[model samples]
Target: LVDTTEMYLRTIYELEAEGVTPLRARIAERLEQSGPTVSQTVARMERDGLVVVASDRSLQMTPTGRTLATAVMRKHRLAERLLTDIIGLDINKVHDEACRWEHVMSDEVERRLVKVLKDVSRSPFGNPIPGLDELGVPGTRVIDAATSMPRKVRIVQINEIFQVETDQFTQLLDADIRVGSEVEIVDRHITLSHNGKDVELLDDLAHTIRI
Candidate 1:
């Protein structure tokens, strides 16, 4: 049940990372699992002491759950890095393949992957690999930053939800939204000045990008 449990735990961790309370329905939606199955699994998780449901019915991970989730996430993102950097996979499609790769990667293999990709500490999409955030980086939400005024900031992170959407991934790439890309706000949009023109971000798309 390691894969099954780790999947739920990872979803919970991601929800918490996004500052969203983990509701049963939200978790179900994210996993694309049926409501009954999600309910039964979360119930099992609670009995196993991996998660706790608060009085408000939002789920929170136990310490053990968090640890497991982080490890899985570390593997997943690192696999994405390896696939893209070594295998020449497109960043837009790596996450889906990494989802499967994360489940089978042994710790020894994980260590080797890190050694092989010495300079890659984040996914091509800009999310920091779990357990590697030594910089204590801060992310500014694009909406908040864009509305304030036209100013420059490097893309520091991409929200997890945004990372899953291949369409959005393509859009972001078209706008030069990869991590460390210097960007600016212009006329209430995240603007990338590239190819001798300014690329304007869709408002909804800009909402999930962090600078």
Candidate 2:
């Protein structure tokens, strides 16, 4: 029923993903819709009961609004996986491409994609689809193996950030370290393990890939 409103909700979701309170100024920064517009739009969202300003003066999504917002975010994540995995978009660049598709992708279509996309649970850049993701499951860690293992990552686990804003994603691919890319920590150096072999990673490539 609403695309602009849809975007605002999703932006709120994104802000939360970055662990930032959804302040009006931060929303403006993300949406690039400054001046008095954010104030009015936020007021509109509050009137719609889609959002509420918190006691600390930050935006908080109401329960119903959160369902709506997370649904939109799930769509966004799914669209990216579709574009990159099935449609052949470069994984690093598909985020923007998915932006356009999320608004148009209908719920029934999302259901269809739910059945079709490989590893719909988690994809590159690793934000598991909300409703579908197994919430409580013990999984193997890269650290689980004393020697080596394959692991999907949150690109953030070290410094507590999500969504790559730098050249890191591309640089990592250039280094052949990505989701499920085999990593080995040996010789006090990182290595990418292949079939019965290990390529000791060098500083140039290693520095770009943060655990």
Candidate 3:
């Protein structure tokens, strides 16, 4: 019914996309909110049939919740495309802008933005735009790539929370790591190089990077 509601839905959607359990703590971490605030909002969401929390605290989006989440995500990615691809905003900054745009955009504006957004299914930070196209990659997460070293691969995706809410994406950008950019895994343990520059990603963060 409001921005916060849509944001909770979208945050859960993004968490699901990251292959993480949609737990209350995850929601608090991703949204940068306090535990009690998350608890209160989740209570309201459950009352309104938006989500159901399990006894173990896993959050499940109802079908109705998912439909709206997907639409909000679509708008967000389109807005990201508008800001980064069309308007030429910094890739590092587009997500924050799109976060606001996603809540305010009407259906008509979304269609126009989609039209203007043009030919891409993934956002600048490499997450898929919901309902536009599938995850078109045979990929490996950087951490898991440890055993598959001494190979070349393109960086294809990143987790949504790390892509925007954390400084992780900035490190990737600083190292010229980008979607479709070639990276070489030189040895075991994720020693990587991109365009001849060493790119050191933390092991925890390596899970956030899909290649």
Candidate 4:
């Protein structure tokens, strides 16, 4: 499949995983493309039998679309891991670069990469990479967590949808937020307390975190 096609399919797959009905407008918004452009491409995807529009206007991937999208998604996440861990790229910057990397990886290269990498369950952002079963348990958004009391929580994952924003991503890393880091909810902020230092995340930023 073409790279553009892969991008659209992968996005739809992500939206579906998040339990957000994948509408054309949502896809357009996420990709930062104009409405007519998104609508035309989506129409082309439908014509090509890669996706189908439901009665409610949600986009549904066909089996063919799912297979291709899964493959690309797998490569993309693994590439993120490799770039961050092996190449030493900043985790905050790797996801966007991985978008380009994913399209170039051959199946054989990925096969070898799987053997080279350890802990393939999740990406640097804590988002689970597609695996054999291609299913993941949903995580609750951090904004929904209780704020009245300081409860210790571990960040389980970061939403893929929000990972693309550079400023937001920088803020997350600056706060030392990552999977397995223990944090506490303090009022409307997420506080990372380490070495008697506190890195506070505001409520709007906290909404992007999943614990």
Candidate 5:
């Protein structure tokens, strides 16, 4: 049976295609697995013909591997939809729980799950899912911090910001930013501290905020 790590690599491939570079550290961080665990799994994927490790130690999926991973990820997303939209579980645990079930769920079960959760084309967190085929050209998207879905829609997609020392995920929550959570971009002005510390995230931060 194909493993979830391989499935994750597929998902990572899709995410990379959509502009999210799934570095080893980021993959480990996002999946909440240990760094060594991610490294080991990725290594196994490399050996199994699912992934090709680049000279820079980055990872890429083979076409056949992507095809397989795509199907697995569909099962995963379908499971997430079933759990969150149908079973009413918390959205935070959706991805983790789906990881557990993806390898076990049958194709027939995945189909039924998709039918049961029809409106789940995208993720609850506002990410355009892999199967959706809606990956537009990167610069064409014209994203900005002020743009978002409807006010009532709670979920959002925030990118990691690599500004000197700012951890984007933590900063998002600290700044009232979260996935599938309501947030209003009240202001975008910059202010510099008195002691010559600069607090600017205008373009660097704005470009990363996708909803």
Candidate 6:
């Protein structure tokens, strides 16, 4: 049966692909659901053979789950593009409506939708909406935040969680950091005041990113 539970699995799968592992409270914060609800849903998904709970308590998609969730998400984002770009809907409204419409779609309908929106690649907000290709989108740029100087640049990707002693992700938001926002890296440092105490964003944080 189609349920929000499956949708949650798809959403988490997308998040994980964007590098958000050990999917925790803050990850669910933006989803407008309580942590417990998110946790319970994820656990149930695990038991259903749709997912696997990692030792770190993060969720992983089983092969079957991965394929299904990817299909759903591709449709979801495609709907966002169609609503926002083709129909002149506002981006926020497009996302909300896409959530409502995504589950009811069949693979055939989703394919037709893609055919109708062939020129569209990004959501209204600039995030790459996964297409059928599923290969990483081309033209995504990566920059070293440490080396980057002040300039208006689009956040084509986020590769690392900036290490901070207090607010590990503090700089993340300050970068005007949404996956697709035009980021102006005003300044950055691994300085003496901050010292060696920085959180050390190893590549482990890589899997937790988007852009």
lDDT of each: 0.76, 0.66, 0.78, 0.76, 0.60, 0.59
The regions of model 4 sitting more than 4 angstroms off are 132-211
Q: Which stretches of candidate 3 lie over 4 Å from their true place?
A: 132-211
Predicted model with the maximum lDDT: 3
**105-195 in candidate 4: lDDT tens per residue?**
7765676677788777888887877853432214446668647577776777766465544565655566666676777665545664433
Give the count of colliding residue pairs in each prediction.
Answer: 0, 0, 0, 0, 5, 4
- Candidate 4 — what's its lDDT? 0.76
Instruction: Please give the range of 10 consecutive residues that has the lowest summed lDDT in model 1.
Output: 131-140
Error of 4 at 157 (Å): 39
Query: What does each candidate score in C-alpha RMSD?
Result: 16.1, 15.8, 16.3, 16.6, 16.4, 16.3
Which regions in candidate 2 have their CA more than 4 angstroms from the true location?
Answer: 133-211
List of clashing residue pairs for candidate 3: none
- State the number of backbone clashes in model 4: 0
Q: Rank the candidates by TM-score, best first.
A: 4, 1, 3, 2, 6, 5
RMSD of 2: 15.8
TM-score of each: 0.60, 0.60, 0.60, 0.61, 0.50, 0.54
Better candidate number, 2 or 6, judged by TM-score: 2
Query: After superposing candidate 6, which stretches have Cα over 4 Å from the reference?
Result: 22-24, 131-211
- Candidate 5 residue-wise lDDT at 112: 64
Give the higher-TM-score candidate: 4 or 5: 4
Deviation (Å) of 111 in candidate 3 = 1.1
Error (Å) of candidate 3 at residue 73 is 0.8
Tens digit per residue, CA lDDT, model 1, 35-101: 9999899999999999999999999889888878888888888888889889998777898999988
Give the TM-score comparing model 1 with the true structure, all chains together: 0.60
Question: Candidate 5, which ten residues in sequence have the lowest lDDT sum?
Answer: 134-143
Estimate the TM-score for candidate 6: 0.54
